[PDB]
PDB file of C-alpha atoms and ligand atoms in Angstrom:
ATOM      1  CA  UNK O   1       7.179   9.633   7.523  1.00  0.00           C
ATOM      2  CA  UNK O   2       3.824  10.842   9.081  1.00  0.00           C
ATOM      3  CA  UNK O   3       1.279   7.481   9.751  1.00  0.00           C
ATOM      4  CA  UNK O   4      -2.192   8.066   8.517  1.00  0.00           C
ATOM      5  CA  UNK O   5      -5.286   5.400   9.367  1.00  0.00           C
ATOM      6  CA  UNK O   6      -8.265   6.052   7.222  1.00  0.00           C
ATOM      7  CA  UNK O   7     -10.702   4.242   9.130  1.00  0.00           C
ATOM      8  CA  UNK O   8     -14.319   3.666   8.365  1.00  0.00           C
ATOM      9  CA  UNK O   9     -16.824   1.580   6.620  1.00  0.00           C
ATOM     10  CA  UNK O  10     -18.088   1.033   3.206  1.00  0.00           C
ATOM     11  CA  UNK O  11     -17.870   5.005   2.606  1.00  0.00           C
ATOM     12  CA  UNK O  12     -14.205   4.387   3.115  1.00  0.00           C
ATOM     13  CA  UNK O  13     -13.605   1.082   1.686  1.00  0.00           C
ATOM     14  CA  UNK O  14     -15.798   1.179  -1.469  1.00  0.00           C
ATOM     15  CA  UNK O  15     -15.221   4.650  -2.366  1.00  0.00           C
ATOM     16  CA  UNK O  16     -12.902   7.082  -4.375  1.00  0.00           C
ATOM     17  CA  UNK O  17     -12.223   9.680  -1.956  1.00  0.00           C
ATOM     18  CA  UNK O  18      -8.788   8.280  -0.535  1.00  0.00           C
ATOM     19  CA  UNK O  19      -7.196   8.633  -4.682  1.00  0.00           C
ATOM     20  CA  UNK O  20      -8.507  12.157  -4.769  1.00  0.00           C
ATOM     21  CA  UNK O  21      -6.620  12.662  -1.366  1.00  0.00           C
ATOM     22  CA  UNK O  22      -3.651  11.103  -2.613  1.00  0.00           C
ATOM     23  CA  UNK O  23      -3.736  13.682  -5.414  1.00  0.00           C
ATOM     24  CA  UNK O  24      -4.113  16.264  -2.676  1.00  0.00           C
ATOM     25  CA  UNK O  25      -1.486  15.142  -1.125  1.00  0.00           C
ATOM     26  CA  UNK O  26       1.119  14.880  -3.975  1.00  0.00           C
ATOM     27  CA  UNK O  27       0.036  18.363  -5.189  1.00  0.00           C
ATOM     28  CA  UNK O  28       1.237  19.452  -1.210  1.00  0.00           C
ATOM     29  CA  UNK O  29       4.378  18.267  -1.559  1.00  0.00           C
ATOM     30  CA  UNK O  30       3.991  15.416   0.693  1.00  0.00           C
ATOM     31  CA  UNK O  31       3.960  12.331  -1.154  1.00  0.00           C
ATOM     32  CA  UNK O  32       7.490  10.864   0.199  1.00  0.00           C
ATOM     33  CA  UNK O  33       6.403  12.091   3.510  1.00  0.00           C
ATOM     34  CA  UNK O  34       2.950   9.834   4.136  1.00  0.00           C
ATOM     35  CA  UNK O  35       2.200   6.202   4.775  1.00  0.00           C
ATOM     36  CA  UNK O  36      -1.586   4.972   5.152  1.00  0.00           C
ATOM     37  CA  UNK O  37      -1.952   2.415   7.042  1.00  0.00           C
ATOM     38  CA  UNK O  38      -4.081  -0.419   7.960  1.00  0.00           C
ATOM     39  CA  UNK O  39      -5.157  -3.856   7.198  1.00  0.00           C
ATOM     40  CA  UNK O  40      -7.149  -3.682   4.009  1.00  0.00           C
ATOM     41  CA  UNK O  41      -5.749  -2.225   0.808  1.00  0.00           C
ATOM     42  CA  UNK O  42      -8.753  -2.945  -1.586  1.00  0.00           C
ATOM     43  CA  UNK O  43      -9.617  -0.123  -4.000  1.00  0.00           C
ATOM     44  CA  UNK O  44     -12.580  -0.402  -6.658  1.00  0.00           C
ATOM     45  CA  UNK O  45     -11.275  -0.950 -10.318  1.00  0.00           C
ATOM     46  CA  UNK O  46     -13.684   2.453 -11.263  1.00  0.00           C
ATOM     47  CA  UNK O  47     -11.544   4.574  -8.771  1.00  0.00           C
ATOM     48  CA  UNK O  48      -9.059   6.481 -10.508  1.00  0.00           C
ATOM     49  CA  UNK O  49      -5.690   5.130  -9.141  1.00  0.00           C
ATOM     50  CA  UNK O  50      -3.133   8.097  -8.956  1.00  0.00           C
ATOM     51  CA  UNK O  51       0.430   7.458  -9.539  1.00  0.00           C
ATOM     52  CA  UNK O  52       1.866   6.359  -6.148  1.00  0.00           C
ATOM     53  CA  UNK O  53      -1.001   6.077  -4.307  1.00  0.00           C
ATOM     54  CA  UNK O  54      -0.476   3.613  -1.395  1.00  0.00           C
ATOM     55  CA  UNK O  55      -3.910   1.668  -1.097  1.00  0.00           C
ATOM     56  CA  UNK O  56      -3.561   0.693   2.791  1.00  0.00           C
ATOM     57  CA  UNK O  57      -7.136   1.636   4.674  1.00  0.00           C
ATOM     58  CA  UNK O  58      -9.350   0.631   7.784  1.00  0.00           C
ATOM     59  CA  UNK O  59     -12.182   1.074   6.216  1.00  0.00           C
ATOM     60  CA  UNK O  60     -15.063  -2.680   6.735  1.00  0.00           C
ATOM     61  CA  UNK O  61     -17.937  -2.229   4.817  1.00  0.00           C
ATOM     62  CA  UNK O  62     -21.511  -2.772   6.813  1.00  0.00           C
ATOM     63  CA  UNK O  63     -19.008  -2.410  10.070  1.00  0.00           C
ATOM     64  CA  UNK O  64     -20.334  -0.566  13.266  1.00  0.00           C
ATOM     65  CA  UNK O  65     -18.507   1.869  15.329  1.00  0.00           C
ATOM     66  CA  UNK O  66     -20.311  -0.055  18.266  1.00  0.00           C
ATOM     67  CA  UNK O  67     -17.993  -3.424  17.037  1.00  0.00           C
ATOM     68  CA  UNK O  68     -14.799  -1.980  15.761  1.00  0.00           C
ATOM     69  CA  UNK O  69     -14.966   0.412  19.080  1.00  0.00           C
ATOM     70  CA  UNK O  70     -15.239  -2.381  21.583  1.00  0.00           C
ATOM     71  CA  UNK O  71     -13.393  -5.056  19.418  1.00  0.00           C
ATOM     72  CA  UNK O  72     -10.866  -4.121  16.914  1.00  0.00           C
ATOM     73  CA  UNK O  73      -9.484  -0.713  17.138  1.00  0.00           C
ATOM     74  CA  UNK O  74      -7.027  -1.554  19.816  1.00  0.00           C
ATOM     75  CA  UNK O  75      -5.550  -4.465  17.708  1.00  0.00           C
ATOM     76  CA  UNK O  76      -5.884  -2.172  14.675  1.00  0.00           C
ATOM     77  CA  UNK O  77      -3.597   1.203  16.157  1.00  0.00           C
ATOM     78  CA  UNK O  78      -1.161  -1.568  18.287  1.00  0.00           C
ATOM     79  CA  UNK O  79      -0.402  -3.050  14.689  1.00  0.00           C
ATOM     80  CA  UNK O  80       0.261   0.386  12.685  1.00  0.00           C
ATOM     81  CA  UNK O  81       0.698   3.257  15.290  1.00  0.00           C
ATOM     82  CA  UNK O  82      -0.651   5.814  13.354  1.00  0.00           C
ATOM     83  CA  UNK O  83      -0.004   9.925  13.969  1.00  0.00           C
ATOM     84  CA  UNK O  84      -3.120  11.126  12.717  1.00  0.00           C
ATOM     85  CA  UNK O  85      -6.651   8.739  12.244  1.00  0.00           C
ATOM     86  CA  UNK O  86      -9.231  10.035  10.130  1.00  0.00           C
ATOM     87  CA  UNK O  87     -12.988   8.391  10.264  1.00  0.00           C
ATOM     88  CA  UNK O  88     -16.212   8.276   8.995  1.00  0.00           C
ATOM     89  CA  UNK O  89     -18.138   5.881  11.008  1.00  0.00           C
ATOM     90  CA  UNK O  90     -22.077   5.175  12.515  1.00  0.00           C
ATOM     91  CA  UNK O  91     -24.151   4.554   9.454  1.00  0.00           C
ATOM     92  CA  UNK O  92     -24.309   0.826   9.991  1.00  0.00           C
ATOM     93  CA  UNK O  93     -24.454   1.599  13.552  1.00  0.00           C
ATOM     94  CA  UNK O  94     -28.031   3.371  12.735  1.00  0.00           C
ATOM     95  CA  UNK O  95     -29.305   1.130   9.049  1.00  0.00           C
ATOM     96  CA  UNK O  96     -27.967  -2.155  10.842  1.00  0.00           C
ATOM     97  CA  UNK O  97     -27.707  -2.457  14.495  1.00  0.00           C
ATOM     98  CA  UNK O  98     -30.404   0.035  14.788  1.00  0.00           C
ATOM     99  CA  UNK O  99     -28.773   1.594  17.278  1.00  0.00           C
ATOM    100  CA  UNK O 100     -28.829   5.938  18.599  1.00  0.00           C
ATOM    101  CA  UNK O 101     -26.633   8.547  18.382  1.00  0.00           C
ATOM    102  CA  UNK O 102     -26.002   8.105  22.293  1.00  0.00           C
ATOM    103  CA  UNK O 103     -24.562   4.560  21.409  1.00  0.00           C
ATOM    104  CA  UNK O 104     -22.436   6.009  18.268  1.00  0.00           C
ATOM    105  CA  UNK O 105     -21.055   8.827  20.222  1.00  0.00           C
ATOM    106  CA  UNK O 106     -20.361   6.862  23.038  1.00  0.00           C
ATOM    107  CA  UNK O 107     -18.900   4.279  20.592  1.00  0.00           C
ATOM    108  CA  UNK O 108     -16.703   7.345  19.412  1.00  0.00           C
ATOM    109  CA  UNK O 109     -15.161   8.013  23.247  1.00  0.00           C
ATOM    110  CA  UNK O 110     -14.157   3.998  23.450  1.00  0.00           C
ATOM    111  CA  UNK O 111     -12.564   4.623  20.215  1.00  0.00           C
ATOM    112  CA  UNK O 112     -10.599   7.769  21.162  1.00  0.00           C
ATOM    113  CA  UNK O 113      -9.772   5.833  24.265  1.00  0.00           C
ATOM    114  CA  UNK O 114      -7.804   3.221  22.818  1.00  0.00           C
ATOM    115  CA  UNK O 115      -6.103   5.825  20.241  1.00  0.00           C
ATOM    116  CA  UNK O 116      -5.128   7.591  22.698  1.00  0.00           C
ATOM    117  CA  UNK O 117      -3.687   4.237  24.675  1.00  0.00           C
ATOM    118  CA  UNK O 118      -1.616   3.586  21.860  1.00  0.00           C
ATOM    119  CA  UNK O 119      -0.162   6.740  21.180  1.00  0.00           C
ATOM    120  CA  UNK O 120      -1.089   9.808  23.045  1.00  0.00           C
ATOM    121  CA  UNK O 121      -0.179  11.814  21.200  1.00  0.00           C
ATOM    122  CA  UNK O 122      -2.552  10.936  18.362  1.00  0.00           C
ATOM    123  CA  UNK O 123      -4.106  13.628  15.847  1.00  0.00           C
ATOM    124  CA  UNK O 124      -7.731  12.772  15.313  1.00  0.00           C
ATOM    125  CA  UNK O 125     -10.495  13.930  12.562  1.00  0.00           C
ATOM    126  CA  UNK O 126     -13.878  12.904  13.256  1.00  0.00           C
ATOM    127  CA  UNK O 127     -16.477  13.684  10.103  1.00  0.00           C
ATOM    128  CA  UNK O 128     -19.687  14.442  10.689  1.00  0.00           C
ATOM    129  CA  UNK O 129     -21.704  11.540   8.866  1.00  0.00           C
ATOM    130  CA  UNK O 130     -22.444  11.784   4.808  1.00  0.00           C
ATOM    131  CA  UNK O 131     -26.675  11.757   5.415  1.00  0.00           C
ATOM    132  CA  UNK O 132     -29.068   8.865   3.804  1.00  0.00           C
ATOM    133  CA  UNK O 133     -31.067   9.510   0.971  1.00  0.00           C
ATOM    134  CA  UNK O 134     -34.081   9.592   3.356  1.00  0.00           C
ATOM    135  CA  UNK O 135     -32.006  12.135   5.429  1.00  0.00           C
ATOM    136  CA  UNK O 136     -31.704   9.596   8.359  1.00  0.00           C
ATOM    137  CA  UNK O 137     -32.831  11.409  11.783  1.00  0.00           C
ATOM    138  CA  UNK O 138     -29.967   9.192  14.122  1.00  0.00           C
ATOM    139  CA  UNK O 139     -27.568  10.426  11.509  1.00  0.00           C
ATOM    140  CA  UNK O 140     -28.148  14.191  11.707  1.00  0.00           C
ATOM    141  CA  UNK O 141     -28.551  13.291  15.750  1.00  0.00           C
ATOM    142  CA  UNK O 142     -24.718  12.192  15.634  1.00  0.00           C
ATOM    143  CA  UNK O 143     -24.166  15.254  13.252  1.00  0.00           C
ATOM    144  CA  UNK O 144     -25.669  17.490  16.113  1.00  0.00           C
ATOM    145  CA  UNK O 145     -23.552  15.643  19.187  1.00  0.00           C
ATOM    146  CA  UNK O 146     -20.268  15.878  17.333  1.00  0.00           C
ATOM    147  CA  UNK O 147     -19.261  19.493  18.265  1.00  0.00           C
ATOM    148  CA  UNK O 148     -20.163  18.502  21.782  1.00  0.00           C
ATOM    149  CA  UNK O 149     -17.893  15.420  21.981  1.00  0.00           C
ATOM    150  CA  UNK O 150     -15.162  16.922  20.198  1.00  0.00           C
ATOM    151  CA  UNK O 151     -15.377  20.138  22.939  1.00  0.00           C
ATOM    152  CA  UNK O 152     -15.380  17.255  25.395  1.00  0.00           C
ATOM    153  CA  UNK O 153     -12.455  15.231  24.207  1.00  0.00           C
ATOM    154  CA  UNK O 154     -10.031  17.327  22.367  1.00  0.00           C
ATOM    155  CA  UNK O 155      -6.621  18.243  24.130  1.00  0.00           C
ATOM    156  CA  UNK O 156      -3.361  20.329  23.372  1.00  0.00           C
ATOM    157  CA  UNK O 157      -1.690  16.901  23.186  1.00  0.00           C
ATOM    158  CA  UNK O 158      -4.402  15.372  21.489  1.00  0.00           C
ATOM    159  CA  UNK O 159      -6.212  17.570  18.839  1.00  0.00           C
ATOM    160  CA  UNK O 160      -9.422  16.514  17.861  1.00  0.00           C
ATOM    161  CA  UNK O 161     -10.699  18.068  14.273  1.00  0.00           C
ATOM    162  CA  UNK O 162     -13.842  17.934  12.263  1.00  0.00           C
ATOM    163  CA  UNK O 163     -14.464  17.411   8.816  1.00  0.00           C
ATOM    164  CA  UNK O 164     -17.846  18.044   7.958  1.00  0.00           C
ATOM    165  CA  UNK O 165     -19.536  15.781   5.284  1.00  0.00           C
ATOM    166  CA  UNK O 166     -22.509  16.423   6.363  1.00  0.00           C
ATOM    167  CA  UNK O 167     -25.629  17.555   4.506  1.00  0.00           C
ATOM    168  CA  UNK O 168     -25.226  21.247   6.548  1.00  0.00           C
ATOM    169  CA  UNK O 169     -22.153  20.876   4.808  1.00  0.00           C
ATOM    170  CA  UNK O 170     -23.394  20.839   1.150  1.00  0.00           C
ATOM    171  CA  UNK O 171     -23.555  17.384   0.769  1.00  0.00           C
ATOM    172  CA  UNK O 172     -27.168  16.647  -1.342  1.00  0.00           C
ATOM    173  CA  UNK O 173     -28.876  13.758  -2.622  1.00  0.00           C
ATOM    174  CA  UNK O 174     -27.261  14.058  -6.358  1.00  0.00           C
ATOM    175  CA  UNK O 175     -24.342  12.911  -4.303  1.00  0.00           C
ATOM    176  CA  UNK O 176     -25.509   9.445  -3.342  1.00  0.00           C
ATOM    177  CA  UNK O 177     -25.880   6.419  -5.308  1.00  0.00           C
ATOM    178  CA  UNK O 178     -28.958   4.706  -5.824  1.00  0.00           C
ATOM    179  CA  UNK O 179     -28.916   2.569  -2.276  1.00  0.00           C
ATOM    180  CA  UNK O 180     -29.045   5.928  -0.680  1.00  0.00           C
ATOM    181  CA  UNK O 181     -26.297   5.476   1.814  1.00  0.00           C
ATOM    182  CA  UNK O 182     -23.092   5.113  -0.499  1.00  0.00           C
ATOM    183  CA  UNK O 183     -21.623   8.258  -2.565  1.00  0.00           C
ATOM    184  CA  UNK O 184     -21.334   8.326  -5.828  1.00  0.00           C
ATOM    185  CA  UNK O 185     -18.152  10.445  -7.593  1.00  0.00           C
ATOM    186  CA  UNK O 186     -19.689  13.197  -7.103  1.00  0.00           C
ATOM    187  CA  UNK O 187     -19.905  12.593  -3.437  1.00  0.00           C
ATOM    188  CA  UNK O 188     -16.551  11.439  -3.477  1.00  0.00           C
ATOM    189  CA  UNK O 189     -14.973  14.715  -4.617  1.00  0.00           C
ATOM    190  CA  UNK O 190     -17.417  16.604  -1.764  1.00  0.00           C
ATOM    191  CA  UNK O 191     -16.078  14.283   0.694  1.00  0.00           C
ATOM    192  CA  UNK O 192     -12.131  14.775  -0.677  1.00  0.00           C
ATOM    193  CA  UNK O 193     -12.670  18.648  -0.828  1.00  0.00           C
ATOM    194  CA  UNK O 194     -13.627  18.386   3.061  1.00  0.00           C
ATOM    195  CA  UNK O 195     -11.340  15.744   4.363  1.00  0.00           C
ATOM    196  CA  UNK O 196      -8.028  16.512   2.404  1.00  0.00           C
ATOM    197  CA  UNK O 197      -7.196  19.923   3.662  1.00  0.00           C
ATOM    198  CA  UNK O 198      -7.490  19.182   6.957  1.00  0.00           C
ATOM    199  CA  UNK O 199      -5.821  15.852   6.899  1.00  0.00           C
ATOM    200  CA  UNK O 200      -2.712  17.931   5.212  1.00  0.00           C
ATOM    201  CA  UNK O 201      -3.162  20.753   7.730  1.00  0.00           C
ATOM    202  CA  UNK O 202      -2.622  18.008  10.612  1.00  0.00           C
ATOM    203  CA  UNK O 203       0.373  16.125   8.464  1.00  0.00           C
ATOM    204  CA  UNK O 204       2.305  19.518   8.187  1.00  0.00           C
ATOM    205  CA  UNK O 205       1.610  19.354  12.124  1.00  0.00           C
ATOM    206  CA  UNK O 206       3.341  16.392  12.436  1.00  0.00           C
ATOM    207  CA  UNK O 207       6.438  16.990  10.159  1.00  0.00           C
TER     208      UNK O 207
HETATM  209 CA1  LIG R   1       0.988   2.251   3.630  1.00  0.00          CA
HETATM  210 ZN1  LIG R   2       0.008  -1.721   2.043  1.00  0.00          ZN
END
């Protein structure tokens, strides 16, 4: 069984990305051969729920890489030792703590840290950040810096990955609700169509 953590914030908690991944998944082959795992296993009741999905996530909506960096991943990867984590994480870093994309990427390297305590050798895909309606500036900054840190911190042992949700990426304003920060379905299958095939390339690295 290959351990996936889907850890994030709202855009992984509140979302319908992980079911269209499960479907990805099952059409792979690979259903009998994945676990997520993690401490919440809430799914909205509009998400369409694919037969066999398993529900487990890390996903805190409104939480800040900053906090779950410095706080809780450590607790979080000693409970489930997962093989590959996949995350989405800074926008409440920038539309709540105010904070820059030195503090989120730094944020990311104390995360990698501890994954990398807990099992080194963990399989890791960063995404570059889903923008704001408003096309947040700190956002695209972290967008920019992620090549850069994962150049910096990717190993042989270790593989570091990007999937890119970004607006570079395709991902446009018809693909956020109303709020301006969460997707809507139709960001939900952009975010699916960029997550799920490399998630499956890294499980069939595993297996
Ligand atoms: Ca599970
Ligand atoms: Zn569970």
């Amino acid at each position: 069984m290959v351990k996936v953590m889907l850890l994030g914030d709202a855009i992984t908690e509140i979302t319908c990305w992980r079911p269209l991944v499960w479907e990805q998944i099952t059409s792979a082959g690979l259903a009998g051969s994945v676990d997520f795992v993690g401490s919440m296993n809430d799914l909205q009741p509009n998400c369409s729920r694919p037969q066999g999905f398993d529900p487990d996530h890390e996903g805190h909506s409104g939480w800040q890489a900053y906090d779950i960096a410095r706080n809780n991943i450590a607790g979080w990867v000693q409970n489930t030792k997962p093989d590959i984590v996949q995350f989405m994480l800074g926008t409440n870093d920038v539309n709540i703590g105010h904070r820059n994309a030195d503090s989120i990427i730094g944020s990311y390297t104390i995360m990698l840290n501890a994954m990398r305590a807990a099992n080194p050798r963990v399989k890791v895909i960063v995404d570059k950040i889903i923008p704001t309606s408003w096309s947040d500036a700190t956002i695209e900054a972290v967008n920019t810096a992620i090549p850069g840190w994962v150049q910096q911190q990717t190993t042989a042992e270790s593989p570091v990955v990007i999937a890119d949700c970004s607006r570079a990426a395709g991902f446009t304003n018809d693909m956020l609700r109303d709020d301006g920060v969460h997707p809507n379905s139709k960001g939900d299958q952009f975010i699916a169509g960029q997550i799920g095939p490399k998630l499956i390339q890294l499980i069939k690295d595993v297996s």
